Amino acid sequence: GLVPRGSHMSGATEACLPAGQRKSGMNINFYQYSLKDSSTYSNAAYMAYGYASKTKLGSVGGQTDISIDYNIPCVSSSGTFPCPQEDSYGNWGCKGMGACSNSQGIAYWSTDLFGFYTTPTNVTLEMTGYFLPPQTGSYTFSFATVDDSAILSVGGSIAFECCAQEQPPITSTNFTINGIKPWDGSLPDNITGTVYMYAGYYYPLKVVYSNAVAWGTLPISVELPDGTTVSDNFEGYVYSFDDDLSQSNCTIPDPSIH
């Protein structure tokens, strides 16, 4: 046929073509999250949009290295150093450092999350931007692990609305990756999610991440249609655009026929 048929039952992921100045990286907003609150981050509504009803702590823009790997301090005989969780032991010490004198259960202040001075022990953050596929085909996003709770959403009207990156969060709970901490204490039952994407369209991307205590971990990757994997550093794939609510043609409801 002269034209492609289109994805069945309007199945294509909505994307966008913002016309404004493109900036490298994602925007990261930080919101208050209570130390040792083991319930708030287990709600879908909280993880999709409720986080923004808490106090906003600040923000940083242009972030391309988006994985989280926050290690709490061990106050040791030789000074204060971050302890990889797998090296913690006993009650407690850190391998190569001896016994730690400090509590695993208090808040700690650090710039480890994107250079922003906050409490990485207890915080929620929202990463927003647009993912630019260089190749048409299936992309599989993943979280290697989640500590404590996280979601990843891709697509117009799922992550956020086209040309409206800076708006308050939309209410969609149609997560691409549901890594929400289960109430039961188990592990989310699936921390990959696949999206079919058309080269050259900008796909809204949102990551919401929460830590309630101690270590914070979120290693983010994407497998490209060519079978290669991009991990942690998404430079060249993620971009931001200032809001332009006036750009009439910004939304591409079906990139397969556009």
Ligand X SMILES: OC[C@H]1O[C@H](O[C@H]2[C@@H](O)[C@H](O)[C@@H](CO)O[C@@H]2O)[C@@H](O)[C@@H](O)[C@@H]1O
Tell me the closest approach of the beta carbon of residue 83 to Cl ion, in angstroms.
10
Nearest Cα to Cα of residue 165 among 28, 58, 12, 67: 28
Structure tokens at 38: 């083991």
Radius of gyration over alpha carbons of the chain, in Å? 19
Tell me the closest approach of the beta carbon of residue 226 to ligand X, in angstroms.
35
Which among 171-179, 196-204, 206-214, 224-232 is the span making contact with Ca ion, rule CB under 5 A?
206-214
Based on CB atoms, which residue is closest to ligand X, 72 or 250? 72
Amino acid at 238: V
Cα dihedral 27→178→57→169 (10° resolution): 70
Pairwise CA distance, residues 66 & 197, whole Å: 21
Q: Does 148 bind Ca ion (CB under 5 A)?
A: yes
Based on CB atoms, which residue is closest to Na ion, 48 or 83? 83
Pairwise CA distance, residues 101 & 92, whole Å: 8
Q: Does 142 bind Ca ion (CB under 5 A)?
A: no
Tell me the closest approach of the beta carbon of residue 46 to Na ion, in angstroms.
24
Half-sphere exposure of 157 (CA within 13 A, CB side): 9
Q: How many chain residues are in contact with Na ion, going by CB under 5 A?
A: 4
Q: How many chain residues are in contact with ligand X, going by CB under 6 A?
A: 9
Amino acid at 194: T
Q: Which of 27, 40, 63, 71 binds Na ion (CB under 5 A)?
A: 71
Which among 4-12, 61-69, 159-167, 206-214 is the span making contact with ligand X, rule CB under 6 A?
206-214
Q: Which of 63, 147, 206, 209 binds Ca ion (CB under 5 A)?
A: 147
Tell me the closest approach of the beta carbon of residue 113 to Na ion, in angstroms.
13
Pairwise CA distance, residues 250 & 239, whole Å: 15
CB distance 128 to 160 below 8 Å: yes
Q: Which of 28, 147, 180, 239 binds ligand X (CB under 6 A)?
A: 147
Half-sphere exposure of 190 (CA within 13 A, CB side): 8
Give, rounded to a whole angstrom, the gap between the first and last alpha carbons of the chain. Answer: 16
Q: Does 142 bind Na ion (CB under 5 A)?
A: no
Q: Does 61 bind Na ion (CB under 5 A)?
A: no
In the complex, the residues that contact Cl ion under the rule CB under 5 A are 98
In the complex, the residues that contact Na ion under the rule CB under 5 A are 69, 71, 73, 82
In the complex, the residues that contact ligand X under the rule CB under 6 A are 36, 104-105, 147-148, 212-215
